[PDB]
A paper describes a structure:
We aimed to crystalize and solve the structure of TR2. The obtained crystals were optimized in 24‐well sitting drop crystallization plates. The crystals of TR2 diffracted moderately, and a dataset was collected at 3.6 Å resolution (statistics for the data are presented in Table S1). The TR2 crystals were phased by molecular replacement using PHASER in the Phenix program, and a model calculated with AlphaFold as a template. TR2 shows an asymmetric unit of four peptide chains building a functional dimer. The TR2 monomer is subdivided into a core domain, which is the PLP‐binding domain, and a C‐terminal subdomain. The core domain is composed of a central β‐sheet consisting of the strands β1–β7 surrounded by helices α1–α2 and the short helical structures η1 and η2. The smaller subdomain at the C‐terminus consists of the three α‐helices and β‐strands 8, 9, and 10. TR2 is a functional dimer, as represented by Figure 1B; here, the tunnel for accessing the binding pocket with the catalytic base (red circle) is composed of the two monomers (highlighted in different colors). TR2 showed maximal transaminase activity at 45–55 °C, suggesting that it is moderately thermostable. Interestingly, TR2E2 was designed using a site where a loop was missing in the crystal structure of the original transaminase TR2; the loop contained one mutation and was modeled with Prime and refined through MD simulations.
Herein we present the development of a PluriZyme, TR2E2, with efficient native transaminase (k cat: 69.49±1.77 min−1) and artificial esterase (k cat: 3908–0.41 min−1) activities integrated into a single scaffold, and evaluate its utility in a cascade reaction. The reaction proceeds through the conversion of the β‐keto ester into the β‐keto acid at the hydrolytic site and subsequently into the β‐amino acid (e.e. >99 %) at the transaminase site. In addition, we report the crystal structures of the TR2 enzyme and the newly designed TR2E2 PluriZyme. It presents the typical type I fold of class III ω‐TA observed in known structures present in the PDB database, and it contains the characteristic pyridoxal‐5′‐phosphate (PLP)‐binding domain composed of β‐sheets and the catalytic base Lys289.
Residue numbers in the entry:
A (entry chain C): 69 to 459
B (entry chain D), D (entry chain B): 71 to 459
C (entry chain A): 70 to 331, 333 to 459
The structure:
């Protein structure tokens, strides 16, 4: 999560370090380090602090469920996720994510989790146009609910784009469908802003870009641009008018939670992410330069895909582009290209054969072309150590 | 004064380091490199963000450890009633607090609880050497119910900080040592709270002399200044996890946080040099015990107990005749504010008054908080005794 | 006197050793399994088994396969009632709301639970029955709401729990249950093994209480105790679906059961012509009821309930103040004996004396058991009148 | 001719054995006072309705056993895939035959499966001695996967008749007893089909020489002529269940059905004195096996296996190359009418022709079924001669 938890500045920016008032709660004598703002998606005006997006996802589940329990349905209790999707490392987070190394047959998905098709087009959609394999994938949802029990089901999770497993930007019509089905069946909606978070793309959160209107959302990293461990959980007023108009087991966080020192920070991080307007140099100014400069796989046979939006991007290491192929072991040519990316003058990752980039937001127009000819020199390069190599 | 230990304020730590985000690449100043102080047969260490994330991850390990030996059916762990071990779903299911588990969602599968050694509220007049056993043996009666081939460990705070105090009689932890081996299981001890000079020795384990194989630390690691969670390991558990690891081959070497680290990294470095660990249990603690053993003739104080650098006492109706209020907490907390609004830091679960002072405390300071609460114990005596009880 | 058998006490010659006892696979021999539609209203198919146990067991896989082809493989769980006997098959022990068969957690199995019984004499002391019938009926709505209308698939229950002693619901009970199996849109299976074939004033107990179940199972009463055989009847609703794309239960309707069990194929016909249920229902039953309903002046009897061809009465220490003994069971079974040894065949679930006589019974044969039981009342009334009981 | 065992038809029996249904009160002619013919260490039995309801009461008892030893967790039982262990939700779950489970309502919690020793449906090339070893060890690999103290029993017909006749090779069953004696579990074998009166002895348990701790019987007890189910028990399992009893304290004082017991009683008292079994396994058997083994040069058959009184054989499309059809059953069943429309009785599980004749078979009759079977095979062979199949 290097350069992806960091969501604003490279280095050398200074901050209201050491508050020196670090414990919490209790009668007077403080300075109030947790009175933060709402550049939030329009209808969200409460939130809940924790130790991480991993210590975040753990509490959403007691949330979504306490909710439906106090409305009369101690059964609307399951939640739906997707395969190959990162959703935190907390055993909850593990149950929530459809990665194969968390579950490992037993242990997880603990009671109350199962996973649906994830909209990965280059490798789960042969030639279908994009507008439908986002519909298909979106309806794959409704299948799982009529295959479970609406009065069993409680909400649906999803990062706006699956980062941590190779960018799975959704075909444009995925989110629009998902919008109806949450209204036709009437359940809840939580989005994971641990990644994406405070900018990383066109707008602030992934909500307003893709417009969606989540009942809840965690934010964690990027709140401090990696600078601090702070776990966030923003709620919607519906969800809120239930846990709070009827509660007592959750009248303590909104009374006190989180750590003053990690908060007192992000206040400036957002308060300095605002004015200077990176959010606007990032979306109306510097990003249409990354994507027009990215996606230029041009004539790189190893690349058969090249994608991205806003401030993140990726592309897939194939063997050939006539047949849209992958290597027999999709991961040897990827895991041996990272080093050829870090050992040449640029930082990049690759969940398998998918070189993934996620750079921060102060970037200018001149430090862009660099990680173009840096990777173009790492991409024309890994095109001789795998061909010379027999694979 | 609980999450923190030893350093109220005025102390300067390596703050603004301004090299902060490091996951794989060099820990700039290697901030993740700390010290195996007095863990002993515990020489490796795993980082998180808080204890809630520690006790969370401490379960994926056990269930991973055993399965590599051939026993994917040894999974269920066991805890204790009124014992806190986090607030994350693994931790909320592990802790013995009923006001978090509601209609199935907690406890998760592979969790159950046992009879907690609360001799005050659970033991009439039985000799502590006895109650220590039956509440210890209350474990063995929970393993045969399930099967020594289904159990995968037993956790426990050395003493329950978050459920008042709950000292185990001397005879408790002695037995536990026997059962945990007679049935071949692992012992993780909750250290987050008792950790770090909060008792007489470094960790709460050395006092009671046990040799756990995983402990979770947090808060105490930096005396409250920074969020972080820690998880410890035995030369054992580690060897096997690494013998044929994989998913976990990425922590002891690239985990935790570069900033919070160096801070705590300063926190302990100064607890050593300045020898607070030594001023706390050897010099001052006994005065604290010796002087907190003073319930005397307060019809409200009937129990008085303490170990190292922490203590408590219970509120009642009548001292000699066994009797307690008709709803402690309607009378305890109403004494909590009577300690702060008089001049002393004191939480109240509702009737078991507590004291969690830092390690730099001084005799005079000892004397100081005594009369101040005697005033608060002279006062609340008629505040609620003056009423119709 | 005796259950399972519902017709002819002894010496009635059926069509025995018909031999040719092969069925099903080859062309049939003489059509053993072809039985009458003698008043099930709209139920027009049937499935066969070996006994009540081996019957209800097959109603689950059916029910749960019903919704499984309407598009809701999750209406899988079913409800039943306490102090009810629905077989000794494992699902028959789970469906039966009796604790003495629920072995551990293995019994009851997933997808079953239990609700209040309309036992107006043990659950209700003086409450108005109608409301007691309404609530204990409303106790279902609660459970479904306690489980989830899209989790529940149906509900079973005995027209009168002959196994739970005898538990006639208040007149307002079932009329409300009719509504709820629609309010939540679900099925309704009734158990007629005991109540089936007379036993009540009508044929089944459905017809008496006026209802329309989706399936019902019968046994014993079919062969009047003469042959092992179990029947599981079905509605023209549930049917159309199973055959609309059959495959798993297109097997029995076309062929299942047992030839020689067609014995009952004459147990009903010879129950039809002679008009036994006829005279049984309209002629002899009303005589019996008003007469058995005569606790009169018997400090042992204070409840007196009877229906169709079946009744009971609870035994009591003192009825001026409604009472039971200090051990209902140490004394009740001390009278059944005092019935047979005195000359009448009664059973006692513990203090609730029972009777279920075959349907051929006559008028003059009514008074005979009466004084005789009375002769067992006055006796048992005073034998323990001298003890320390 | 599967369920039934001896006496093709026309043999008369003590039918009309009076007409009763007794239990607690006195009885006539004793009733269900049957015999003990070569079970050996078995001297008890629990009478049942059908082999479905038989294999269902061997499970509560199974667990009720380990319960009363103090192991409430030894709940599990291990079966074998493609095995017919009843239709009762226990029998259908225990049975390793998919199509009975339905993915949701079965398998009930607490049942998994292993591999079946199908030497020619899988592993026709490995030396039989080893495929028996692995096929046996296949049990340990799932007990080292569950919990040697979670597991509670292994259920295996001597041979899977419903699945054809997949006779376990020689080395399979020796290890099974070694293993069953190692990990501390019981042994339960379904002698319903196989045993009672087929094979080379009464029950097959005497042929393979194993010491079953539990045994169901049914069907062939009456040679079909009545519905009956039986649960034979081991003095081991015995000294235990009745000591407390509970759900089995008295059942042996009365159960079953007087009439289905009076019948079979003769079926055993007559199968002895007429020496059916004796001639069955000594004289009339080895001539049959010697002759069914004659797949000779039939391109359709590739193996000819059988043992005692029962056999079958595999159909294919080439032999030297053992190639099986692209969808056996589009061709197996198509050879089943080709024996009824010629004059002999065979079932086909999908491509395997099973033969299940009775014990009163004669030599001239043996020779009959042979040339008449060959007429079929030689009839069944011309019908494809290289279709597009």
């Amino acid at each position: 999560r290097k350069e992806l938890a960091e969501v604003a500045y490279r280095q050398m920016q200074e901050l209201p370090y050491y508050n020196n008032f670090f414990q919490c709660s209790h009668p007077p004598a403080i300075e109030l380090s947790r009175l933060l703002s709402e550049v939030t998606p329009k209808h969200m005006n409460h939130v809940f602090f924790t130790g991480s997006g991993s210590d975040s996802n753990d509490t959403i589940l007691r949330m979504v469920r306490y909710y439906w329990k106090l409305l009369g349905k101690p059964y609307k209790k399951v939640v739906i996720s997707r395969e190959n999707a990162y959703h935190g490392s907390t055993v909850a987070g593990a149950s929530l994510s459809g990665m194969k190394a968390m579950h490992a047959q037993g242990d997880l998905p603990i009671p109350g989790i199962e996973h649906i098709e994830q909209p990965y087009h280059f490798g789960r959609a042969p030639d279908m146009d994009p507008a439908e394999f986002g519909r298909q994938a979106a309806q794959a949802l409704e299948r799982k609910i009529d295959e479970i029990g609406e009065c069993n089901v409680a909400a649906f999770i999803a990062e706006p784009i699956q980062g941590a497993g190779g960018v799975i930007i959704p075909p444009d019509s995925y989110w629009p469908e998902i919008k109806r089905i949450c209204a036709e069946r009437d359940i809840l909606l939580i989005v994971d802003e641990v990644i994406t978070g405070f900018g990383r793309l066109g707008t602030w959160f992934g909500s307003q870009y893709y417009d969606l209107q989540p009942d809840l959302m965690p934010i964690a990293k990027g709140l401090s641009s990696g600078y601090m461990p702070i776990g966030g959980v923003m709620v919607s007023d519906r969800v809120a008018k239930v846990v709070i108009e009827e509660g007592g087991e959750f009248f303590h966080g909104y009374t006190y939670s989180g750590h003053p020192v990690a908060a007192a920070v992000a206040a400036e991080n957002i308060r300095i992410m605002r004015d200077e307007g990176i959010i606007e140099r990032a979306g109306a100014e510097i990003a249409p330069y990354l994507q027009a400069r990215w996606r230029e796989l041009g004539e790189h046979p190893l690349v058969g895909e090249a994608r991205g939006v806003g401030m993140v991007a990726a592309l897939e290491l194939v063997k050939s582009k006539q047949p849209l192929e992958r290597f027999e072991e999709p991961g040897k040519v990827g895991s041996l290209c990272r080093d050829l990316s870090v050992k040449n003058g640029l930082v990049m990752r690759a969940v398998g054969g998918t070189m993934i980039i996620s750079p921060p937001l102060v970037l200018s127009r001149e430090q862009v072309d660099e990680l173009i000819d840096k990777a173009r020199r790492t991409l024309d390069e890994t095109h001789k150590a795998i061909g010379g190599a027999l694979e």
